[PDB]
Design a protein around this ligand. Structure first.
Ligand SMILES: COC[C@H]1CC[C@@H]2/C1=C\[C@]1(C)C(=C(C(C)C)[C@@H]3CCO[C@@H]31)[C@@H](O[C@H]1O[C@@H]3COC(C)(C)O[C@H]3[C@H](O)[C@H]1O)[C@H](O)[C@@H]2C
Ligand SMILES: COC[C@H]1CC[C@@H]2/C1=C\[C@]1(C)C(=C(C(C)C)[C@@H]3CCO[C@@H]31)[C@@H](O[C@H]1O[C@@H]3COC(C)(C)O[C@H]3[C@H](O)[C@H]1O)[C@H](O)[C@@H]2C
Lengths: 5, 236, 236, 5
């Protein structure tokens, strides 16, 4: 999964 | 609410204690109590609110993905019928996740967003609104799915417009908003080109503004910049 | 109970799903539902029950220790008075932990232990009974503290007596029981010499019985044997 | 803390 903040 | 009898300052103190104890459900309940006191939130308080619910929903999302994967495999050819239990339990976790998203969206709508006038608060809350509609979209399948996606898009877009007018390119809220809106494009909206374009343009404009910053601000901005680069490396 | 309308087999299936999803509170609630169906538990089912509640109470214990440490520091000389909040929140977590321990002890008393006749079930349940009284003892401070400690000791001792009569020295339940009773001696009963003696004698008698085992049984026994050695290395 | 199982 891609990075989120 | 069960927090209605506790002082606002005590709720904030206990939210920090719960964070230290990795008790994120408690943390979130304390911060909801604090929001329901009706006063605006300071910068530090906004960060406690977002961290609390990000961790709660993050765990629910991870669990939902495990269960959804099991469910999908059980619906492949040659899989032995195992009854309704996998679907039932995935539904149970999904409903609890949706309830948390609705709670957060409720707090933002009553009345955090409407009283947020400074860019750093308004963009922060609208990013959260996009995030929690995005989590609802991750599990949505019915008549309402396109409207959920467009609600996420709309919130992210208003946050984007404000952030570009009112914040420098290296502002960490602006950067994190762009990171997440880029992921929305890739994973939710079936728009990988838009996701890549947004991540690259955001990274490059931030690069060019790093020279204005102190060392401490530099550390904060480059942290999220590396997440943009990580995603671009995953996507290209 | 809220699980009274769900089939026993479905509760067991969902406990396994929750384990896969790292949803240990759910896991524990499903297994309590299964216990309350009134039938004895198989070996695999006993293991699901213990894993579920071990993880739930393990998290509560970790959080309690964080909060207790903060509380202690706030009561040192020169510490600024911060009000009742640290004590209140430590008390909140403590009460929730005590509630989980009481729930497990209730299941063992109604009616798991009384129907457990085979050594592998009776020793298993009496080890759990010692474990959950030990967790109650970790937070106990009042008139009842010595009785809680002796309840832990009594349960562990009955489990020890049965395990020595009925199980080989390498049996994993016997080994884990000895590991934990040794920790009870060191950390609860202020008896470090007894803790060291028990850990060493257990390890040595297991060493001498390894030759009787298959490779798979050898793996299981040596795993817990290494924990005995780890503790002996910590203590000497 | 010491090891338990
Ligand atoms: C609504 O969206 C919130 C996002 C947008 C990007 C990011 C956000 C959140 C937090 C609060 C922040 C950061 C930093 C570390 C990138 C994390 C990203 C995940 O959640 C936290 C904000 O950082 C702040 O709070 C952090 C709390 O955790 C510590 C580690 C104490 O580090 C703290 C930082 O020192 C502090 O500047 C960061 O400024 C902004 C607001
Ligand atoms: C009441 O006390 C229960 C303790 C006593 C020692 C240990 C106990 C528990 C579990 C169930 C067992 C083990 C093994 C790995 C040492 C762990 C110790 C912590 O909890 C689990 C039991 O192991 C069983 O279940 C495990 C579940 O986790 C997997 C990894 C699937 O590995 C499984 C093993 O393959 C299986 O043999 C082990 O036999 C015994 C019963």
């Amino acid at each position: 999964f891609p990075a989120t903040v | 609410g069960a927090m209605g009898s506790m002082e606002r300052a005590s709720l904030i103190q206990k939210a920090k204690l719960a964070e230290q104890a990795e008790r994120y459900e408690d943390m979130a309940a304390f911060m909801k109590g604090a929001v329901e006191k009706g006063e605006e939130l300071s910068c530090e308080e906004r960060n406690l609110l977002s961290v609390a619910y990000k961790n709660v929903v993050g765990g629910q999302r991870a669990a939902w993905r495990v269960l959804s994967s099991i469910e999908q495999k059980s619906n492949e050819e040659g899989s032995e019928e195992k009854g309704p239990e996998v679907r039932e339990y995935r539904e149970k976790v999904e409903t609890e996740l949706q309830g948390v998203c609705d709670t957060v969206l409720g707090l933002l709508d009553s009345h955090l967003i409407k009283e947020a006038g400074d860019a750093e608060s308004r963009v922060f809350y609208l990013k959260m609104k996009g995030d929690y509609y995005r989590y609802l979209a991750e599990v949505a399948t019915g008549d309402d799915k396109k409207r959920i996606i467009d609600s996420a898009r709309s919130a992210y877009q208003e946050a984007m417009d404000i952030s570009k007018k009112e914040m420098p390119p290296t502002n960490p809220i602006r950067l994190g908003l762009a990171l997440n809106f880029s992921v929305f494009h890739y994973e939710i909206a079936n728009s990988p080109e838009e996701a890549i374009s947004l991540a690259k343009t955001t990274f490059d404009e931030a690069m060019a503004d790093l020279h204005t910053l102190s060392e401490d601000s530099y550390k904060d901005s480059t942290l999220i910049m590396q997440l943009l680069r990580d995603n671009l490396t995953l996507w290209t």
